[PDB]
Design an enzyme around this catalytic site. Structure first.
Site, PDB file in Angstrom:
ATOM      1  N   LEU B 148      14.899 -26.422  30.644  1.00 28.21           N
ATOM      2  CA  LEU B 148      15.148 -27.626  31.439  1.00 28.21           C
ATOM      3  C   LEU B 148      15.233 -27.339  32.922  1.00 28.21           C
ATOM      4  O   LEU B 148      16.130 -27.825  33.604  1.00 28.21           O
ATOM      5  CB  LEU B 148      16.427 -28.345  30.982  1.00 28.21           C
ATOM      6  CG  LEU B 148      16.536 -29.810  31.483  1.00 28.21           C
ATOM      7  CD1 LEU B 148      15.736 -30.726  30.607  1.00 28.21           C
ATOM      8  CD2 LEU B 148      17.981 -30.307  31.575  1.00 28.21           C
ATOM      9  N   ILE B 151      10.357 -28.201  35.658  1.00 25.66           N
ATOM     10  CA  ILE B 151       9.348 -28.864  34.825  1.00 25.66           C
ATOM     11  C   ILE B 151      10.028 -29.641  33.684  1.00 25.66           C
ATOM     12  O   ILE B 151       9.765 -30.821  33.487  1.00 25.66           O
ATOM     13  CB  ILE B 151       8.292 -27.875  34.312  1.00 25.66           C
ATOM     14  CG1 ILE B 151       7.560 -27.230  35.506  1.00 25.66           C
ATOM     15  CG2 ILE B 151       7.303 -28.589  33.428  1.00 25.66           C
ATOM     16  CD1 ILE B 151       6.652 -26.051  35.165  1.00 25.66           C
ATOM     17  N   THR B 172      22.761 -21.537  29.597  1.00 27.21           N
ATOM     18  CA  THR B 172      23.937 -22.191  30.159  1.00 27.21           C
ATOM     19  C   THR B 172      23.598 -23.648  30.482  1.00 27.21           C
ATOM     20  O   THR B 172      22.482 -23.947  30.944  1.00 27.21           O
ATOM     21  CB  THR B 172      24.507 -21.465  31.396  1.00 27.21           C
ATOM     22  OG1 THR B 172      23.534 -21.436  32.443  1.00 27.21           O
ATOM     23  CG2 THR B 172      24.929 -20.026  31.035  1.00 27.21           C
ATOM     24  N   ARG B 228       4.875 -20.907  27.036  1.00 31.33           N
ATOM     25  CA  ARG B 228       4.061 -19.745  26.769  1.00 31.33           C
ATOM     26  C   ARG B 228       3.874 -19.604  25.263  1.00 31.33           C
ATOM     27  O   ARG B 228       4.807 -19.878  24.473  1.00 31.33           O
ATOM     28  CB  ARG B 228       4.694 -18.461  27.353  1.00 31.33           C
ATOM     29  CG  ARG B 228       4.489 -18.301  28.861  1.00 31.33           C
ATOM     30  CD  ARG B 228       3.098 -17.777  29.216  1.00 31.33           C
ATOM     31  NE  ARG B 228       2.821 -17.821  30.654  1.00 31.33           N
ATOM     32  CZ  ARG B 228       2.456 -18.915  31.336  1.00 31.33           C
ATOM     33  NH1 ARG B 228       2.334 -20.121  30.759  1.00 31.33           N
ATOM     34  NH2 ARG B 228       2.256 -18.815  32.640  1.00 31.33           N
ATOM     35  N   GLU B 257      -4.491 -15.937  24.095  1.00 29.32           N
ATOM     36  CA  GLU B 257      -5.530 -16.741  24.730  1.00 29.32           C
ATOM     37  C   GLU B 257      -6.637 -15.832  25.224  1.00 29.32           C
ATOM     38  O   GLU B 257      -6.338 -14.771  25.726  1.00 29.32           O
ATOM     39  CB  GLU B 257      -4.969 -17.505  25.932  1.00 29.32           C
ATOM     40  CG  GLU B 257      -3.934 -18.523  25.528  1.00 29.32           C
ATOM     41  CD  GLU B 257      -3.170 -19.124  26.678  1.00 29.32           C
ATOM     42  OE1 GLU B 257      -2.079 -19.618  26.407  1.00 29.32           O
ATOM     43  OE2 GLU B 257      -3.624 -19.135  27.822  1.00 29.32           O
ATOM     44  N   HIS B 275      -4.995 -24.386  27.711  1.00 30.53           N
ATOM     45  CA  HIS B 275      -4.111 -24.101  28.847  1.00 30.53           C
ATOM     46  C   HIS B 275      -4.496 -24.889  30.112  1.00 30.53           C
ATOM     47  O   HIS B 275      -4.697 -24.301  31.150  1.00 30.53           O
ATOM     48  CB  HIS B 275      -4.071 -22.594  29.122  1.00 30.53           C
ATOM     49  CG  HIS B 275      -2.791 -22.123  29.756  1.00 30.53           C
ATOM     50  ND1 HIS B 275      -2.322 -20.830  29.607  1.00 30.53           N
ATOM     51  CD2 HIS B 275      -1.905 -22.751  30.566  1.00 30.53           C
ATOM     52  CE1 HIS B 275      -1.200 -20.694  30.290  1.00 30.53           C
ATOM     53  NE2 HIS B 275      -0.920 -21.846  30.875  1.00 30.53           N
TER      54      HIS B 275
HETATM   55  N1  A2R Z   1      16.225 -17.427  26.789  1.00 31.26           N
HETATM   56  C1  A2R Z   1      16.276 -18.706  27.168  1.00 31.26           C
HETATM   57  N2  A2R Z   1      16.906 -19.594  26.366  1.00 31.26           N
HETATM   58  C2  A2R Z   1      16.995 -20.868  26.765  1.00 31.26           C
HETATM   59  N3  A2R Z   1      16.528 -21.430  27.884  1.00 31.26           N
HETATM   60  C3  A2R Z   1      15.907 -20.527  28.657  1.00 31.26           C
HETATM   61  C4  A2R Z   1      15.736 -19.180  28.381  1.00 31.26           C
HETATM   62  N4  A2R Z   1      15.072 -18.546  29.421  1.00 31.26           N
HETATM   63  C5  A2R Z   1      14.870 -19.507  30.290  1.00 31.26           C
HETATM   64  N5  A2R Z   1      15.347 -20.729  29.896  1.00 31.26           N
HETATM   65  C6  A2R Z   1      15.312 -21.977  30.652  1.00 31.26           C
HETATM   66  O1  A2R Z   1      13.975 -22.265  31.016  1.00 31.26           O
HETATM   67  C7  A2R Z   1      13.977 -23.038  32.240  1.00 31.26           C
HETATM   68  C8  A2R Z   1      12.997 -22.448  33.224  1.00 31.26           C
HETATM   69  O2  A2R Z   1      13.062 -23.213  34.447  1.00 31.26           O
HETATM   70  P1  A2R Z   1      12.355 -22.684  35.765  1.00 31.26           P
HETATM   71  O3  A2R Z   1      12.715 -21.266  36.070  1.00 31.26           O
HETATM   72  O4  A2R Z   1      12.716 -23.548  36.952  1.00 31.26           O
HETATM   73  O5  A2R Z   1      10.783 -22.791  35.503  1.00 31.26           O
HETATM   74  P2  A2R Z   1       9.743 -23.991  35.340  1.00 31.26           P
HETATM   75  O6  A2R Z   1      10.418 -25.253  34.868  1.00 31.26           O
HETATM   76  O7  A2R Z   1       9.101 -24.222  36.688  1.00 31.26           O
HETATM   77  O8  A2R Z   1       8.626 -23.380  34.367  1.00 31.26           O
HETATM   78  C9  A2R Z   1       8.986 -22.778  33.110  1.00 31.26           C
HETATM   79  C10 A2R Z   1       7.764 -22.139  32.503  1.00 31.26           C
HETATM   80  O9  A2R Z   1       6.732 -23.127  32.332  1.00 31.26           O
HETATM   81  C11 A2R Z   1       5.622 -22.342  31.909  1.00 31.26           C
HETATM   82  O10 A2R Z   1       4.435 -22.999  32.088  1.00 31.26           O
HETATM   83  C12 A2R Z   1       5.638 -21.110  32.811  1.00 31.26           C
HETATM   84  O11 A2R Z   1       5.298 -19.962  32.050  1.00 31.26           O
HETATM   85  C13 A2R Z   1       7.084 -21.055  33.329  1.00 31.26           C
HETATM   86  O12 A2R Z   1       7.672 -19.767  33.158  1.00 31.26           O
HETATM   87  C14 A2R Z   1      15.434 -23.073  32.715  1.00 31.26           C
HETATM   88  O13 A2R Z   1      16.031 -24.299  32.314  1.00 31.26           O
HETATM   89  C15 A2R Z   1      16.070 -21.908  31.969  1.00 31.26           C
HETATM   90  O14 A2R Z   1      17.463 -22.166  31.689  1.00 31.26           O
HETATM   91  P3  A2R Z   1      18.603 -21.021  31.729  1.00 31.26           P
HETATM   92  O15 A2R Z   1      18.350 -20.046  32.839  1.00 31.26           O
HETATM   93  O16 A2R Z   1      18.493 -20.358  30.367  1.00 31.26           O
HETATM   94  O17 A2R Z   1      19.929 -21.752  31.889  1.00 31.26           O
END
Ligand code: A2R
Ligand code: A2R
Ligand code: CL
Ligand code: CL
Ligand code: CL
Lengths: 318, 318
Positions: B148, B151, B172, B228, B257, B275
């Protein structure tokens, strides 16, 4: 038990529910030639699509026509009104579904998602690489709604959450709305780059989207029609796409369904759907229920649930 | 002029703009074996997709890796951080686009719009009549967002306007949001019928969407992946679709991919995209510009525009 005629195809849910109160009479097509003398005591009709006048006029005791759909342009409501026959439709229950379809058609037209899926499915991703980038996007667009009733308003609500500017055109404005009103269709088109048609199939809207409207829309222009095919001048649209007068189009409805002109099928910047705006099981079940519940309310209380505006009638019985 | 390596394919907009400040060095693939001695003075890399460590480690004066995309899982950031090498990505400029694609994929999955368009194009509407009604709908659904961030939040904002209940799962919680937080993925999956995956491709999220998560999702369950491919256990998903453990899926990303397992191609209740989440000309131009602008800001001010969280570095001019 009043006898209800169902001509041609309808959702089985209508057929399943009619026996709660009625006797059902079926004919395989909406054709006056299939009517027999034993059918002259029919009191009501439940129908999807066209009700030809000669069929409607085969029944001297006809009280009510329950139309499956929000659009009832297949029923001659002037002739029904002249005979004191109430006409009902199915609004509200399909509003959100139609609005969802509109958005999906818009996104598919802009981003070419169905073509991208075909690319993948045909094995193209592996050997020719990435699907080409879509020349268009929803980003930065300004949307003009032609018509703004229950469905138009539901589309606008969805569009606000996509961060686009919204405008609208109707005969008379709506107070208490933050969207820009335009008193003319052509005027709205000049101002916007995306035009969503969501009006009834009336004489007033016949070929309203014409060469001039498209020309005003502009070379980044996108036309979406989820209203009625008759509202778009299909010939002028083809020419406009050919010339690059507009950038793309997405169409759920056509002048003479189910026929779609071969020229529209050739364009790579066009998305075409076979009138699927309300076509999910859950929404068609709700529509089926409303057709039947209208008939049940009429014959039991003398008041229909969703009579059309042209027929605000109450039942008279001896 | 610092010398920037561009390995393999990249958007031509990047290559057009690099000359504003840099000398460009090209190799046809991201492969250390193509590096010649004349390339040892390379200071930066601009890349889309995988950067193998041996390639990254061919360059002793490497200062910065500018990744094309918000996702930077193709870059070994631990190894870059250990060498003092800053890594940049392309967030924000694609957020709304990826969110629009997510909604379009969800609508296509639920309502089968691409299949309906095929039915029309193939001539079925004329010969056989109406496309069958879609067994699924967005009406009445409850959506769980796995991830969340920028995006995920943009997808939720769109979904609120479609009248569906929204829930989310992250490590969190987020304060000041009206959406239901779930401390577990499996727990969210139990509570919802529609699961949208939008997390980074990290070790923590590897095969997180597994047999158990899908089983909890339920027999009306719909999985949408726009994150991903590695996050979904692709084998368990195939089994779950086969058994009717879930009702459908829509996928923009895959484990390996551009290969898609033949079994996924056979299902009538699955929508597949190659993609394309950010793949419009306007958004890829904005991404291209951000790659280049990051390199320009680094070499001219010593501060990158969008360094990744693992590398909050400032330039030291050796
Ligand atoms: N192990 C995990 N378990 C649960 N949620 C996870 C975990 N790792 C990360 N997230 C969440 O994913 C979200 C990522 O948000 P952003 O860093 O702002 O990235 P964005 O929304 O721009 O894009 C996410 C992904 O969208 C894909 O297209 C691309 O590979 C990229 O890495 C946060 O809410 C991040 O939340 P948090 O840091 O876990 O509180
Ligand atoms: N000549 C016209 N010029 C401009 N706008 C027109 C014209 N005729 C009608 N409309 C608008 O269309 C809208 C229709 O909204 P509703 O009656 O609430 O129906 P709904 O939104 O559920 O369905 C509209 C059409 O959606 C199609 O599926 C089907 O053929 C159906 O007639 C109203 O805002 C209605 O607004 P108004 O009565 O003109 O203020
Ligand atoms: Cl139906
Ligand atoms: Cl309709
Ligand atoms: Cl690109």
């Amino acid at each position: 038990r009043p006898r209800i005629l169902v001509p041609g195809k309808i959702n089985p849910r209508v057929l399943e529910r009619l026996p709660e109160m009625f006797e059902t009479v079926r004919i395989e097509r909406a054709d006056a030639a299939l009517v027999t003398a034993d059918m002259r005591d029919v009191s009501g009709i439940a129908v999807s699509g066209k009700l030809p006048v000669p069929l409607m006029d085969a029944f001297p005791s006809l009280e009510i026509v329950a139309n499956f759909g929000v659009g009832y342009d297949g029923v001659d409501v002037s002739r029904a009104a002249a005979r004191g026959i109430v006409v009902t439709n199915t609004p509200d229950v399909l509003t959100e579904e139609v609005a969802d379809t509109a958005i999906g058609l818009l996104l598919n037209t802009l981003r070419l998602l169905p073509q991208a899926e075909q690319w993948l499915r045909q094995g193209r991703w592996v050997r020719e690489g990435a699907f080409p980038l879509s020349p268009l996007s929803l980003r930065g667009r300004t949307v003009g709604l032609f018509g703004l009733g229950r469905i138009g308003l539901a589309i606008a609500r969805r569009l606000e959450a996509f961060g686009v500017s919204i405008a609208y055109h109707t005969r008379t404005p709506r107070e208490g709305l933050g969207f820009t009103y335009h008193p003319t269709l052509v005027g709205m088109a000049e101002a916007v780059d995306t035009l969503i048609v969501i009006v009834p199939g009336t004489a007033s809207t016949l070929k309203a989207v014409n060469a001039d409207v498209l020309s005003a829309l502009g070379p980044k222009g996108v036309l979406i029609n989820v209203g009625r095919g008759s509202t778009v001048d299909e010939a002028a649209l083809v020419t406009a796409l050919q010339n690059g007068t507009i950038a793309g189009a997405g169409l759920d409805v056509f002048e003479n369904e189910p026929n779609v002109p071969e020229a529209l099928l050739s364009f790579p910047n066009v998305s075409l759907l076979p009138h699927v705006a309300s076509a999910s099981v859950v929404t068609r079940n709700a529509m089926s229920d409303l057709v039947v519940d209208n008939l049940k309310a009429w014959f039991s209380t003398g008041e229909a649930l969703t009579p059309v505006a042209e027929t605000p009638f109450r039942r008279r019985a001896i």
